[PDB]
Amino acid sequence: HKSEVAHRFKDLGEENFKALVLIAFAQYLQQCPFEDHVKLVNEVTEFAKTCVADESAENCDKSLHTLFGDKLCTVATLRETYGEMADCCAKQEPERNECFLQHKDDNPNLPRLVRPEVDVMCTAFHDNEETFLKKYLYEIARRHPYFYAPELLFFAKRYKAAFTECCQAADKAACLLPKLDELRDEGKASSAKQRLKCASLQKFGERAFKAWAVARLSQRFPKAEFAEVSKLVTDLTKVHTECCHGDLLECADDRADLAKYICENQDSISSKLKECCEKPLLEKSHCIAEVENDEMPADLPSLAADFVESKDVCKNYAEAKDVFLGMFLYEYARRHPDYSVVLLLRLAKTYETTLEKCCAAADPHECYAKVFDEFKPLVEEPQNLIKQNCELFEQLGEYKFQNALLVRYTKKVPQVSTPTLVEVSRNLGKVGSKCCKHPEAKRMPCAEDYLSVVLNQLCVLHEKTPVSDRVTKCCTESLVNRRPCFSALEVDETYVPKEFNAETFTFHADICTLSEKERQIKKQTALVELVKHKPKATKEQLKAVMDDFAAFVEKCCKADDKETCFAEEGKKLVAASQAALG
Numbered sequence: 001h002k003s004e005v006a007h008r009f010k011d012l013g014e015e016n017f018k019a020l021v022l023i024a025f026a027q028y029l030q031q032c033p034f035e036d037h038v039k040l041v042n043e044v045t046e047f048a049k050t051c052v053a054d055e056s057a058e059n060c061d062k063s064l065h066t067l068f069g070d071k072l073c074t075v076a077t078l079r080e081t082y083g084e085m086a087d088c089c090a091k092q093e094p095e096r097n098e099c100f101l102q103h104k105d106d107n108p109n110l111p112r113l114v115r116p117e118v119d120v121m122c123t124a125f126h127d128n129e130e131t132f133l134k135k136y137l138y139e140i141a142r143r144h145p146y147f148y149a150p151e152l153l154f155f156a157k158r159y160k161a162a163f164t165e166c167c168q169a170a171d172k173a174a175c176l177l178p179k180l181d182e183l184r185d186e187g188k189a190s191s192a193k194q195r196l197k198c199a200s201l202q203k204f205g206e207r208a209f210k211a212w213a214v215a216r217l218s219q220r221f222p223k224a225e226f227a228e229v230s231k232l233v234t235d236l237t238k239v240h241t242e243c244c245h246g247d248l249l250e251c252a253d254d255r256a257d258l259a260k261y262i263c264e265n266q267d268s269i270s271s272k273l274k275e276c277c278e279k280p281l282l283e284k285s286h287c288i289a290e291v292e293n294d295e296m297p298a299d300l301p302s303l304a305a306d307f308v309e310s311k312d313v314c315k316n317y318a319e320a321k322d323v324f325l326g327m328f329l330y331e332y333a334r335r336h337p338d339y340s341v342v343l344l345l346r347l348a349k350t351y352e353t354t355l356e357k358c359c360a361a362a363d364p365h366e367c368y369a370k371v372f373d374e375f376k377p378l379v380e381e382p383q384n385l386i387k388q389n390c391e392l393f394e395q396l397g398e399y400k401f402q403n404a405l406l407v408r409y410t411k412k413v414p415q416v417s418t419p420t421l422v423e424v425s426r427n428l429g430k431v432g433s434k435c436c437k438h439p440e441a442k443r444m445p446c447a448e449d450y451l452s453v454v455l456n457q458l459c460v461l462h463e464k465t466p467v468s469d470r471v472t473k474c475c476t477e478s479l480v481n482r483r484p485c486f487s488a489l490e491v492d493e494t495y496v497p498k499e500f501n502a503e504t505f506t507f508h509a510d511i512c513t514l515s516e517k518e519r520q521i522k523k524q525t526a527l528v529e530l531v532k533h534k535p536k537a538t539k540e541q542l543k544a545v546m547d548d549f550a551a552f553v554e555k556c557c558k559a560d561d562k563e564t565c566f567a568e569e570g571k572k573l574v575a576a577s578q579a580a581l582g
């Protein structure tokens with residue numbers, strides 16, 4: 001149509017429009033106060049209503065980039081507050097927008113947002129539901145310039161729902177705090193996954209991305225023809241390149257088109273897309289990205305037909321290596337929604353290496369006749385880790401399971417920071433309590449998903465403050481070897497134990513008054529330090545020292561005079577404990 005703004009306003013709605021415009025400005029003008037953004041939002045919203053009334057009104061024919069760019073350049077404190085960024089306003093539109101992305105600071109030095117008390121939140125919520133949520137939408141959007149805006153809006157609505165419900169509860173906190181903790185983690189995970197997929201697309205390149213996409217979409221849409229999946233992998237690749245670059249508008253349109261495309265060809269892709277394809281513009285793509293795997297045809301041939309036996313596998317492969325490998329992935333993935341994507345990538349990798357070191361042999365058909373026997377050990381490695389770890393988690397509880405990981409990883413990389421080990425082991429523990437509750441068929445995809453963020457974050461923290469070559473080795477390995485690399489780490493025979501420190505192992509009644517979370521972290525911290533001090537201790541030896549500790553705590557956190565107890569019974573525990581640990 002003639003007016004881009006009018007169009008977006010129409011099929012978006014005033015409410016969503018105002019929220020998005022807000023998120024958009026907060027993502028570029030990250031240093032401006034809330035009240036300034038609110039003002040801009042009103043001016044842009046007013047402008048929009050105008051174009052809705054008269055498609056031909058002034059400026060209404062200008063593109064969103066142009067309009068958005070002009071408003072941005074309106075801010076008078078631009079040069080003083082943003083310096084260099086102000087120089088962007090001197091360029092012709094095509095480059096002006098390009099210039100703004102380059103200055104969108106991915107990580108500003110804003111204060112960590114603190115969670116106020118439930119009572120204060122709920123009261124603010126009730127006094128002014130809108131400015132309360134917009135204020136935070138603003139605080140979140142400015143701290144996360146790259147988070148896809150629409151999704152950030154999607155989260156805002158879940159936050160609103162949690163307040164509406166919880167602030168009306170007998171006991172507010174019991175209802176809200178957890179919903180909020182769940183919202184945060186999920187938000188951080190969605191965030192980490194977007195940065196991950198973008199880093200990946202940057203480091204490893206387009207081929208690795210498409211490979212990942214083929215495998216993932218084939219498990220998701222096992223009934224779609226391979227030509228259809230290829231189509232989608234192509235569009236998804238363009239979509240993410242554009243979304244990673246940070247240009248919100250281009251990004252949103254490509255996603256919109258794709259969502260539209262999928263829905264129109266819905267019956268030719270999956271049966272579980274009805275719901276999603278009904279939903280409103282703003283949610284189609286998000287819904288689709290998260291849709292459940294469709295059901296795979298029960299009448300499916302044996303892979304070995306076209307991939308192992310069939311003479312002339314090389315003829316088809318040499319004719320177009322990637323396509324052939326792609327079909328292999330497609331065929332293999334849609335039959336295995338229970339495999340993790342990386343495992344599927346590992347198989348395809350293995351197969352590629354084999355076709356390369358076989359198609360250039362006397363009797364090819366016999367060189368690669370095995371192949372499928374190559375996969376068995378690749379498939380089993382991840383499955384065994386899942387059963388073995390989920391069983392342990394079943395016996396012990398999340399907490400005790402975290403302590404087990406704690407001991408296990410401190411011994412593998414003692415060089416790592418204690419607080420880093422504690423966090424990593426804790427998040428690793430959550431992955432266990434989250435995924436082990438699923439039936440085997442969904443366990444691996446689940447672990448992969450959560451483990452990818454956890455490992456990524458682990459690596460990032462290590463990128464900054466390097467400590468182990470082995471960690472760096474794993475972290476810089478190919479995406480397909482990342483987790484197997486970490487699983488392959490063994491006890492550090494090198495490590496020289498930190499000599500004893502009286503402080504580190506001293507305790508006061510503070511732990512009696514502290515809440516579970518802080519108490520566990522206090523205990524878990526001591527544990528890492530314990531292992532670092534005597535890394536040659538046994539599950540058995542440590543287990544004894546740990547038990548004598550559980551008691552020691554109880555004994556003192558209950559005794560009339562707690563203070564003394566922790567000092568006298570403290571001297572003892574430590575003295576005795578050292579004796580036992582030689």
Ligand SMILES: CC(=O)C[C@@H](c1ccccc1)c1c(O)c2ccccc2oc1=O
Nearest residue numbers: 212213216217236255258259285288289
């Ligand atoms: C996040 C996902 O697992 C699904 C995702 C995707 C990303 C890269 C390669 C394959 C699959 C995904 C989307 O981003 C998406 C965007 C717009 C429309 C449909 C989409 O579907 C997806 O599956």
Ligand SMILES: CCCCCCCCCCCCCC(=O)O
Nearest residue numbers: 114115136137140155156159184
């Ligand atoms: C996600 C955008 C919607 C804005 C609503 C957020 C309101 C919750 C405020 C708490 C934020 C502090 C983060 C946390 O620790 O949970």
Ligand SMILES: CCCCCCCCCCCCCC(=O)O
Nearest residue numbers: 020064068252255256281282285
């Ligand atoms: C002046 C510019 C303000 C316009 C705001 C950008 C509009 C975003 C459209 C989002 C549509 C959802 C697309 C999707 O992800 O499926």
Ligand SMILES: CCCCCCCCCCCCCC(=O)O
Nearest residue numbers: 208210211322323325326348349
């Ligand atoms: C058109 C289909 C494109 C898919 C290409 C198949 C590539 C499979 C090889 C496995 C990739 C492992 C990732 C990597 O090491 O880069």
Ligand SMILES: CCCCCCCCCCCCCC(=O)O
Nearest residue numbers: 340382385389431432447448483
């Ligand atoms: C399952 C949670 C417990 C923590 C142990 C994780 C073990 C799962 C490893 C398998 C990861 C699948 C990804 C891959 O194929 O490398």
Ligand SMILES: CCCCCCCCCCCCCC(=O)O
Nearest residue numbers: 385409413416420421424486487
């Ligand atoms: C802080 C550095 C410690 C890093 C600990 C390594 C994390 C291991 C992740 C792999 C989980 C699968 C279980 C395993 O094979 O050990």
Ligand SMILES: CCCCCCCCCCCCCC(=O)O
Nearest residue numbers: 505523526527530546549577578
């Ligand atoms: C070298 C002697 C110092 C003694 C070390 C004791 C510290 C053990 C902390 C482990 C916490 C037990 C875990 C728990 O059940 O909460």
